[PDB]
Design a protein around this ligand. Structure first.
Ligand SMILES: O/N=C/c1nc(CCCCNc2c3c(nc4ccc(Cl)cc24)CCCC3)ccc1O
Ligand SMILES: O/N=C/c1nc(CCCCNc2c3c(nc4ccc(Cl)cc24)CCCC3)ccc1O
Ligand SMILES: *[C@@H]1O[C@H](CO)[C@@H](O)[C@H](O)[C@H]1NC(C)=O
Ligand SMILES: *[C@@H]1O[C@H](CO)[C@@H](O)[C@H](O)[C@H]1NC(C)=O
Ligand SMILES: *[C@@H]1O[C@H](CO)[C@@H](O)[C@H](O)[C@H]1NC(C)=O
Ligand SMILES: *[C@@H]1O[C@H](CO)[C@@H](O)[C@H](O)[C@H]1NC(C)=O
Ligand SMILES: *[P@](=O)(OCC)N(C)C
Ligand SMILES: *[P@](=O)(OCC)N(C)C
Ligand SMILES: [Cl-]
Ligand SMILES: [Cl-]
Ligand SMILES: [Cl-]
Ligand SMILES: [Cl-]
Ligand SMILES: [Cl-]
Ligand SMILES: [Cl-]
Ligand SMILES: [Cl-]
Ligand SMILES: [Cl-]
Lengths: 532, 532
């Protein structure tokens, strides 16, 4: 029986899942940490104490306690990223899609979801890995981690809640794969972690973190990098937020031991209802509880780690989507609506960029205003929303990642960089949002191969191109088959900075992605504010 | 007789000269002031004392002591701006061109020369007014002023060397025109001052100066403006270049009366030989002794004058050439040469930007650079050479002028704005220099009207078109004839900001001349350095 598999903790039984007129195996809801209930809340993950019997592993597990988006009640474009199982703090489980017949020792891809470190589920329809595992004969693994206060409350010096704890659940999931994937036909020597958004940030931090280097082989980062402004906070302010969350819910603040005991016999929606207020009095693409730079999970600041090359040297394949900031305007900024062109006055474009660069002084606001403004045309309603949506995209992902890539490439054994700019044919979201972040995921997981989903034939063609790039990268460390006649995706070299477009057309090679905007974001603006 | 004219200072007998198969009458080298020699060096002008007997005004006067340019001995492209008569401290003369028959209270146009306040001559061949006098039936005067230390050495607080005496020389000549032009057929109530570069900034400063405002009626500014960064210094810097002048010539510096005494025994070229040594910085496009913000000629700072509206309110007609920067780059910047295409290496580019913005700190240069560079193509000799021509042009001429235009227009009674971008077809300079600043002047004085200078038949029509714009501007305050016939030159209005091309192509209208760069140069960088 290929659906019964005896793991280092106990026996497991999956289920025969159908996929494209064929079937493949699925083991869903397998637990990798002891559930973090009660006193365990906020603590480092403990590995799952072994269990007797057969673990019915044929359903999806629960999701983690997290905010639930209700800006657009019953709107498929937004519900699709919300929890689809029940929520529980007993949520640390991983899923596995094995081909069948079961491979003897094959490549393993581990997916890490995004959701801003405040949300995310391993069980979304759009992360359902049966199509990629079967179509590409890889062993696919979805993991899950604590988010919000539950995984990222930081009180440095305390070991009852040290911070970066949600990152350690992904490491323990990772070590679980390194200990057990071999019995599902996985090769632990060829594990590929790959995430999107906060997932792609987490991949990059395992790249950085010494404790996680040896649990995976390569790395794929989509639309996210470890040095994104929103993906980390320094230890001080990290405490600060933990302690304003106390003031926000009538806690004791003469200690850490009771500031904490104060935050455990809460039930969980109580902390999510108030998760959102402790920020520097503005959101627009900043989230409550996120990884901390703690001198342990991260030995140093990230800038000096990438400077010294203090990280895992390997191959990475990474990229962004074109329009990475439309979601955050839509849900925050003035005069962005799902049901207008969201053309935008100049007056509310200025207030855009004051939101969009949280920290900026008076002179920083004037800089950023000046590089995104067509001063022959300053109340042009479209160029102004297009402009400001580029500020949030450029500043929060695209240019942060291009920093990561230029610094990385100087040390690793290969980089591949993509620019994903295909607006999907069935996208429920408004046109003006362009190629939103998140809607290349549906192509990585072969969803266009399901024809009841009314994708075009050229999008089945493109998801197959992308899946083979992704899986071949996971096997060979290189997106392309050699011995091949298709157009080759050039290595990103520290000199020429080549990259590719991913879309329905035959492929193209561009040099230096978004240089002009990223010279301003990464080299010149940092110096303007450093300046007294 | 006709050439015998009796002035408020005595009789002048001028000469009858040929102009384009016809003849008009010139009065050359009339003295409007007493020789500024001996103990009267650095002293304010004195009115020329009346002369008994006739003044033989048949030949051009002397030229004021200058630095003479000699990078290219023999090169007509440079020689045409060197003094073409004996140099002498006794040099305050003005020349008058009178059409024939002598008219009856007709329009007066006074010309002030440029030369960076260190040079210039009324006697050059491109300032020969006989063509404009003749074809537009106006009276053309060209004045003169002491240049360099002789005109602008300033120890504010002494009355022996107060500074701006060189501007007082121009005013003294304006007063001469106000008191005697009627006796040549001129109308003292319809006097137009105009000038190029430092001559243009000078008409700008008579607009500001309350002691000058009643001596003329309108004003034409060519490629210069009072607020230009090379056009003024403070009482404190002017003093300190005065004392360093003395120090270079081992002068006693215990006081002014000692220092000023010590500097008047020196042969004139003794100052000229050390004039450039007192510039505070290695720089292109700065000159040593320039008009000072002293509190008399200029009541207060030029910005607050332009702000409160404290200036002469009338019509102005003004503009810029396409490529102001080119001249100075050839002379002072590296990689630039007269005989190659002057492709600039990136390393040589950064050298050039530090010389163009010499008062700028480290953050200020990274600002200038990031704004003029294509980072997709940063080693493209052309795009660096051309970009640097644009930095020097916009920093020093183009965007000082628009700042002046915008501020004046709130109170003035009419503004016409031109962008001169025709490169003369007989130009002897390389083409990478484009429209050299100053080579509009051939067209204002009508030199294409003579066929031996081998101009183009369409450049003749441009010069008649221009001369007529300048002349009916002088007469009526609008360069269009009310005979609603040709392309009308729109009013520059604070809202719509229209301006025009002048070239052989039929005339078109544009808006917001170089707006995107001037926002950087007038509103962003100044705020940068006031803060860093
Ligand atoms: O960008 N949208 C931002 C945003 N939305 C809302 C919608 C209703 C509350 C839901 N809670 C929020 C969410 C988020 N940010 C927040 C930042 C601050 C605060 Cl008080 C709440 C936030 C981002 C993801 C969507 C949920 C309110 C304020 C916002 O400022
Ligand atoms: O454009 N720069 C030109 C330039 N020519 C020279 C040649 C003769 C020595 C003094 N002559 C001048 C100096 C300067 N400005 C000048 C501008 C135009 C001209 Cl003809 C002369 C200038 C500034 C620095 C001090 C020296 C030296 C350095 C220069 O840089
Ligand atoms: C496992 O759970 C599923 C879900 O209800 C159920 O249908 C199935 O019978 C269970 N299998 C075993 C062996 O208990
Ligand atoms: C990868 O490493 C090998 C040896 O360790 C080296 O020879 C090869 O050139 C490297 N490739 C890249 C792209 O760095
Ligand atoms: C005026 O001066 C010129 C130049 O020296 C001379 O040739 C001419 O004869 C003079 N004319 C009179 C009338 O003195
Ligand atoms: C100039 O002033 C007159 C009245 O003094 C006014 O009627 C006219 O419209 C003004 N024109 C401009 C261009 O300011
Ligand atoms: P990602 O987690 O997007 C989900 C809202 N990130 C851009 C923070
Ligand atoms: P101008 O007088 O031109 C002569 C070199 N200068 C721009 C100050
Ligand atoms: Cl299916
Ligand atoms: Cl922040
Ligand atoms: Cl398509
Ligand atoms: Cl494959
Ligand atoms: Cl290859
Ligand atoms: Cl131009
Ligand atoms: Cl302005
Ligand atoms: Cl107006």
């Amino acid at each position: 029986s290929e659906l019964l598999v005896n793991t280092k903790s106990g026996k497991v039984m999956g289920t025969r899942v159908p996929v494209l007129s064929s079937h493949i195996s699925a083991f869903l809801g397998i637990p990798f940490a002891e559930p973090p209930v009660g006193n365990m809340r906020f603590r480092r993950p403990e590995p799952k104490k072994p269990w007797s019997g057969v673990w019915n592993a044929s359903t999806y597990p629960n999701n983690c306690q997290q905010y639930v988006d209700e800006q657009f009640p019953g709107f498929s474009g937004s519900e699709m990223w919300n929890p689809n199982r029940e929520m529980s703090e007993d949520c640390l489980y991983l899923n596995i899609w094995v081909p069948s017949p079961r491979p003897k020792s094959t490549t393993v891809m581990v997916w890490i979801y995004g959701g801003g470190f405040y949300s995310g589920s391993s069980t979304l329809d759009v992360y359902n890995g049966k199509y990629l595992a079967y179509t590409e004969e890889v062993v696919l693994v979805s993991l899950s981690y604590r988010v919000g206060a539950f995984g990222f409350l930081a009180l440095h010096g305390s070991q009852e809640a040290p911070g970066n704890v949600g990152l350690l659940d992904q490491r323990m999931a990772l070590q679980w794969v390194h200990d057990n994937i071999q019995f599902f036909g996985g090769d632990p020597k060829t594990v590929t972690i790959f995430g999107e958004s906060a997932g792609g940030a987490s991949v990059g931090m395992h790249i950085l973190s010494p404790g996680s280097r040896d649990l995976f082989r390569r790395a794929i980062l989509q639309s996210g990098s470890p040095n994104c402004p929103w993906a980390s906070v320094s230890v001080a302010e990290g405490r600060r937020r933990a302690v304003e969350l106390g003031r926000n819910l009538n806690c004791n603040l003469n200690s850490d031991e009771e500031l904490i005991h104060c935050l455990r016999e809460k039930k969980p929606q109580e902390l999510i209802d108030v998760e959102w207020n402790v920020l520097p009095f503005d959101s627009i693409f900043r989230f409550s509880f996120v990884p901390v730079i703690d001198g342990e999970f991260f030995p140093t600041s990230l800038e000096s780690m990438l400077n010294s090359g203090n990280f895992k040297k390997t191959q990475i394949l990474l990229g962004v989507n074109k329009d990475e900031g439309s979601f955050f305007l839509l849900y925050g900024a003035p005069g962005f609506s799902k049901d207008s062109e969201s053309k935008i006055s100049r007056e509310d474009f200025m207030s855009g960029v004051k939101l969009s660069v949280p920290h900026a002084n008076d002179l920083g606001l004037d800089a950023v205003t000046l590089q995104y403004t067509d001063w022959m045309d300053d109340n042009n309603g479209i160029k102004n929303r297009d402009g400001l949506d580029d500020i949030v995209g450029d500043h929060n992902v695209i240019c942060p990642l291009m920093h990561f890539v230029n610094k990385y490439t100087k040390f690793g054994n290969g980089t591949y960089l993509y620019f994903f700019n295909h607006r999907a044919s069935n996208l429920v979201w408004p046109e003006w949002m362009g190629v939103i972040h998140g809607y290349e995921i549906e192509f990585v997981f072969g969803l266009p191969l399901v024809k009841e989903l009314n994708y075009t034939a050229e999008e089945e063609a493109l998801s197959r191109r992308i899946m083979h790039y992704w899986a071949t990268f996971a096997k060979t460390g290189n997106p392309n088959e050699p011995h091949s006649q298709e157009s080759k995706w050039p290595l990103f070299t520290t000199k020429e900075q080549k990259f590719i477009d991913l879309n329905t057309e035959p492929m193209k090679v561009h040099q230096r992605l978004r240089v002009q905007m990223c010279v301003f974001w990464n080299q010149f603006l940092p110096k303007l504010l450093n300046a007294t």
